[PDB]
Design a protein around this ligand. Structure first.
Ligand code: BEF
Ligand code: BEF
Ligand code: MG
Ligand code: MG
Lengths: 125, 121
C-alpha cells in the first residue's frame, strides 16, 4: 500500500478535467473527477479529499455555493481554478472559503506547485 | 483588539509605502523593510503573522530570504514580485512560499490573498 494525497477535480468541461487529472496522477497524486456541482457537494463531504480543485461555473451548484455547503463539514484546502478571472470574482471566491484562486488557462506545473503549497501548509499544521 | 502583523519586504520604497498604507486602512498592522539581509533578521526576531516578500532585493534576494527564515519562521509567506515567469513562480513556491503573486496586484486582491493565508493560522 501507498497512500497518496487525494485530489478531487470539480469541473464540468469533461475533457479538460480528464487532461488535468492525468497530469496530476503522473506527479504523485491520486485524482478523481466530478462534473456536477451538486454531486460534488455530497462527494466532497463523504469522501473528504485532501484537496479540491474547484471550478466556479458548474451545473447544479456553482463553486461559491459548493464552498458555502461543504465548508461546515469539510476543512481541507480548496483551490479554485476558473475562467472567472475578474478581481471581484477572485475576492468573492477567497472570501467564501477558497484557499487559492487560479485563472484559466493555468500552466500544468504552476497548478501542481500551487496544489503542493496548500498540501504542505496543511501537513505542516 | 489585536490586529494581524504584516511585514512588507520591498526595495521600491514608494511602492512599499503605498501598499503599507492601503493594508493599514483595512485592519492590519504593517511594517516595511527594504533590504533582504535586514529582512532575514527582522522576520526571525519580530515573528510577523505574515510576510509580503519581494524577490529582487539588495543584500539577499527573496528566495534566499525565504530559505533562511523558514527554519525559524513558519508563518505564511506571500511572494509579490515582477518575476512572473512560470519557472520563477514554481521555484518560489517550492522554496517555501505559500503564495506567489504577480505585480502589479490590485489592492483588494492582495488583501483577500493575505486574509486567505491568515485563515489557515
Ligand atoms: F467554468 Be469555470 F468557472 F471556468
Ligand atoms: F523586485 Be521584485 F521581485 F518585483
Ligand atoms: Mg465550468
Ligand atoms: Mg525589488
Amino acid at each position: 500500500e501507498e497512500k497518496l494525497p487525494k485530489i478531487l477535480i470539480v469541473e464540468d468541461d469533461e475533457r479538460l478535467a480528464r487532461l488535468t487529472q492525468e497530469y496530476l496522477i503522473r506527479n504523485g497524486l491520486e485524482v478523481g473527477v466530478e462534473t456536477d456541482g451538486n454531486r460534488a457537494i455530497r462527494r466532497i463531504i463523504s469522501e473528504q479529499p485532501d484537496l479540491v480543485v474547484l471550478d466556479v461555473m458548474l451545473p447544479g451548484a456553482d463553486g461559491l455555493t459548493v464552498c458555502r455547503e461543504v465548508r461546515p463539514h469539510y476543512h481541507q484546502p480548496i483551490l479554485m481554478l476558473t475562467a472567472r478571472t475578474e478581481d471581484m470574482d477572485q475576492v468573492l471566491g477567497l472570501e467564501m472559503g477558497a484557499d487559492d484562486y487560479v485563472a484559466k488557462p493555468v500552466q500544468p506545473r504552476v497548478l501542481l506547485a500551487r496544489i503542493r503549497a496548500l498540501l504542505r501548509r496543511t501537513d505542516k499544521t
